[PDB]
Amino acid sequence: REPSPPSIHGQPSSGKSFKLSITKQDDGGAPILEYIVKYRSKDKEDQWLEKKVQGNKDHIILEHLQWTMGYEVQITAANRLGYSEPTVYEFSMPPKPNIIKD
DSSP states (O other): OOOOOOOOOOOOSSSTTTEEOOOOOOSSSSOOOOEEEEEEEEOSSOOOOOEEEETTOEEEEEHHHHHHHOOEEEEHHHTSSSSSEEEEEEEOOOOOOOSOOO
16 A cells, blocks of 8 residues: 555635546555545534546546535545545635635
């Protein structure tokens, strides 16, 4: 197993959605077929949503992210091993934009 520290870059795509780029981390030792992403609300710690991605996607766009609520994101790359180089990313959302630019 050869993983490493986080590897997620969040950015304000469009609206409240955030682009969390999955940066190809050191694979456990086998090519990843799909990425299992699970995220939840920081306020609520009793549920975990699911989001699957293609090992070639290397990115995901999440929608419906209120400006007054944060949510944790957990990336898990699934290779022949099953799961490796997981990324536990966490970040709250900023207040409603006043410049509606970024």
